[PDB]
UniProtKB/Swiss-Prot annotation, chain A:
One of its GO terms (molecular function) is mRNA regulatory element binding translation repressor activity. This is Small ribosomal subunit protein uS4. It holds the Pfam family S4. The gene is rpsD. One of its GO terms (cellular component) is cytosolic small ribosomal subunit. Disulfide bonds: none annotated.
Swiss-Prot record, chain B:
Coiled coil: none annotated. Belongs to the universal ribosomal protein uS11 family. This is Small ribosomal subunit protein uS11. PANTHER family: 40S RIBOSOMAL PROTEIN S14/30S RIBOSOMAL PROTEIN S11. The gene is rpsK.
Length: 205, 118
RNA sequence: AAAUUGAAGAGUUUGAUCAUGGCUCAGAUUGAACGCUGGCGGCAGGCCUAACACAUGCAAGUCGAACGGUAACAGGAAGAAG
RNA sequence: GACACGGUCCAGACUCCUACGGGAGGCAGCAGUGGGGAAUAUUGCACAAUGGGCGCAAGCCUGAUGCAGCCAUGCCGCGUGUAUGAAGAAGGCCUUCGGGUUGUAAAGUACUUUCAGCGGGGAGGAAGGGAGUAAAGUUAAUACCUUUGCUCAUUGACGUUACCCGCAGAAGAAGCACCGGCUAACUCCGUGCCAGCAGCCGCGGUAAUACGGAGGGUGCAAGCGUUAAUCGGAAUUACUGGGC
């Protein structure tokens, strides 16, 4: 239910580094970018049509560690909801608790911030939630649990959060160790390298 | 403690008397700096384009402290050193992405100093 | 307010082509089974076969405020008793 | 209210018992047994709640119902660690013999303890009636009741419950299919129309990206595959929506 293998292998595959690893040590040093893994990786692979669509879907999922089954349920909900499906799907993926904690700055990585959620270290509106897939609703206030704050890893993750341009729709609190999910995010804020219309067609096949 | 971070920006203060090379992150937090005056050059030597390049060589520090790799370039000031320094960054192993001039140009603002009759 | 909204192809007949015309593939979905593997929880489901036979226990009893009763119990009084 | 599932009568088959004279039985109620088949669960618990039958009521009666057990059968959620960590360890395999590849993967070094381990607390489902009280309606007597309020003591099958809190230490938790085209993902060795694979196209006859093994890689995941079945694609029975 979670990916447990090496991470730099996936990173260098599919090509553009997209929010993986701690984010401190230079990504290039840890591996060899612009070279898919495998003995035969050092070659130019003429990608196809199915190929491009597959890569995009795989890329999106890994950025948010969403398994197929789960991801498909998001697509069904996004199609059900009114509006443009692709942005709605992106909004749902960003609204997961584990992703929000990572962007809020309490975790160095999405996986580590997700582990913080899993290990019962996060408080939402005075209620303990340890489910990474919980959907955060607008105006909610997320507050690190008192006991959790004593973790020095969380403290260090706050420090690093400064480098990532603080998401607008998230009001981060430094010493207050809290956050307010102001509202839903918008396509503009999200990495412009995502072509959501490609995702919509692929699952509508 | 000693951190690590890429995607920096380089501010170049090309004054008529000195060249100021500062490497900083996208949010203005300084990571390192070097000056021609602090590189062993005084007087006329403190303004020649060459010495400005030498100052960049010093700024080549912070490598382990900050793996900037790709960095932006900000250039302000009409003094010599608007070309030299830029080369040195390339030869140091850096990815120059954009190069723009940020020289302050008033739209008839404050009164400038009087002319040097000499 | 809303509850009207979604509709992809591909491979194979030829020296190559177009066309008709098959077959096949990707998609869903199950009261499924088999194989390999298998941490936990929630929810739902679980003889599709032979309305074939069925060991055995249980699934319709209750009412004394309907009545003769008191079988069994509890007490109850008399009568007596080492 | 039946031509009556656990009523009766009769006949038929079967079933079983008997002292031979004669009897009794009907799980397509719940468990379960055998059989059949590829393949479908415990001879569970409690009437606590609901619901119904009888009873003034109190109650009693429930295989209805509520729960529990079994199976990854499906749906959903979750975990099997988090970061650091490159003289890119060794080893593996390839090799243009220079290397690359595994792979920051590991090891190591910080860090955390979800659930599962254990321990200690702890809701909710619970409404009820009963016993009392006092007043009211109800009377000849407001005795009888019945209506209020109250007062005391109440009941949970699940259930070692939902949940909470402490304990310890990464400790206990990843496979499966595929990589010739369709169709994402490749080489090496073995084999030599042999053995084999095969949804379609087709592979293999001694330099096999198609078989077999190795490494590597792709998809999905506590599941992955195969098979069976339905629709789609199939405008391929065309009303929409075809042709001669
Ligand atoms: Mg009984
Ligand atoms: Mg009957
Ligand atoms: Mg019966
Ligand atoms: Mg039965
Ligand atoms: Mg009992
Ligand atoms: Mg019973
Ligand atoms: Mg536990
Ligand atoms: Mg391919
Ligand atoms: Mg699952
Ligand atoms: Mg089929
Ligand atoms: Mg049709
Ligand atoms: Mg026709």
């Amino acid at each position: 239910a979670r990916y447990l293998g090496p991470k730099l292998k996936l990173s260098r595959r599919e090509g553009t580094d997209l929010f993986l690893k701690s984010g401190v040590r230079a990504i290039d040093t840890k591996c060899k970018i612009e070279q898919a893994p495998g003995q035969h990786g050092a070659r130019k692979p003429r990608l196809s049509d199915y190929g491009v669509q597959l890569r995009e879907k795989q890329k999106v999922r890994r950025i948010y560690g969403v398994l197929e089954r789960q991801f498909r349920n998001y697509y069904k909900e996004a199609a059900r909801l009114k509006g443009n499906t692709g942005e709605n799907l992106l909004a749902l993926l960003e609204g997961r608790l584990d992703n929000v904690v990572y962007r809020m700055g309490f975790g160095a990585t999405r996986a580590e911030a997700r582990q913080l959620v899993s290990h019962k270290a996060i408080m939402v509106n005075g209620r303990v939630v340890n489910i990474a897939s919980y959907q955060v609703s607008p105006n909610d206030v997320v507050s690190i649990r008192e006991k959790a704050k004593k973790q020095s890893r969380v403290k260090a993750a706050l420090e690093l959060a400064e480098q990532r341009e603080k998401p607008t729709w998230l009001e981060v609190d430094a010493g207050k160790m809290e956050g307010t999910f102001k509202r839903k995010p918008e396509r503009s804020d999200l990495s412009a390298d995502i072509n959501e219309h490609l995702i919509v067609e692929l699952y509508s096949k | 403690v000693r951190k690590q971070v890429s995607d920096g920006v380089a501010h170049i203060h090309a004054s008529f008397n000195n060249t100021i090379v500062t490497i900083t992150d996208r949010q203005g937090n300084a990571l390192g700096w070097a000056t021609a005056g602090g590189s062993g050059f005084r007087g006329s030597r403190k303004s020649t384009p060459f010495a400005a390049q030498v100052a960049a060589e010093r700024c080549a520090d912070a490598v382990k402290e900050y793996g900037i790799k790709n960095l932006e370039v900000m250039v302000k000031g009409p003094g010599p050193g608007r070309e030299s320094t830029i080369r040195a960054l390339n030869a140091a192993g850096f990815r120059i992405t954009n190069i723009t001039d940020v020289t302050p140009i008033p739209h008839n603002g404050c009164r400038p100093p009087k002319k040097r009759r000499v």
